[model samples]
Target: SHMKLQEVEIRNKDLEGQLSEMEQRLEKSQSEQDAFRSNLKTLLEILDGKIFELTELRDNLAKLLE
Candidate 1:
């Protein structure tokens, strides 16, 4: 299986690709992630979503401080 093979490679990139796919498919909510078995995926789902939000927020915050 592609998922099993991906797991054996041992890289964040491979896992992230799968993680991103999952994030896109699922809505952002605490209840949903908790129902799933993978705690890592649960946390990562939120992390990726935060990355996008924080990146934009960073730019605005930095500019205002100048």
Candidate 2:
């Protein structure tokens, strides 16, 4: 029983080390964030083009000059 107690303590320490290793692995998703941003940027560009198109149509309807 006494040897079992020491063995459990050593095993717990190994698990603690692995827990931090797992945490570092999770930190590796920053590139995923950047990839999402790039996709969102393309969406924004498309939206901007549509907005400009609507404004041009409005100006043509008003036909107030220039």
Candidate 3:
């Protein structure tokens, strides 16, 4: 009976450690995702500016009968 109790305690400790590691992984992934979203937003803003400039250029060319 004592040995069985000891085994159960050891398993419980291992499970606790695994759970902690999983939580840390989840936290890191969430943080990384946030940073990625920010960077993507920045890139989209830059693309928007380029599109606006291109639109103006296109109008000028059309006016020139090109």
Candidate 4:
């Protein structure tokens, strides 16, 4: 029947809209995750540099005491 076809069309439109919204949300989430990963990598590099400097200083102080 024509009425049944109309109902199906309406439901299809609703599902398409929902699918589009979900896709946008997924893209936004992925963007945020990438940004967080970049920041974490930078922070780790800085910490590693600091640790190396501290170890060198400690070694120098020990040599001086000996």
Give the alpha-carbon lDDT of every model: 0.83, 0.93, 0.99, 1.00
* Top lDDT prediction, candidate number: 4
Q: Write the per-residue lDDT of candidate 2 for residues 1-66, one digit (tens) a residue.
A: 999999999999999999999888777677778889999999999999999999999999889665
lDDT-best of 1 and 2: 2
Q: Who is ahead in TM-score, 2 or 4?
A: 4
Full candidate order by lDDT, most accurate first: 4, 3, 2, 1
Q: Flag regions of model 4 displaced more than 4 Å.
A: none
The sequence of per-residue lDDT tens digits that candidate 1 reaches over residues 12-56 is 777889999888777556567766758778799999999999999
> What is the total number of backbone clashes in candidate 4?
0
Of the pair 1 and 4, which is ahead by lDDT? 4
Q: Could you give the C-alpha RMSD of every candidate to the true structure, in order shown? A: 19.1, 3.5, 1.4, 1.1
Q: What value of lDDT does candidate 4 attain over all alpha carbons?
A: 1.00
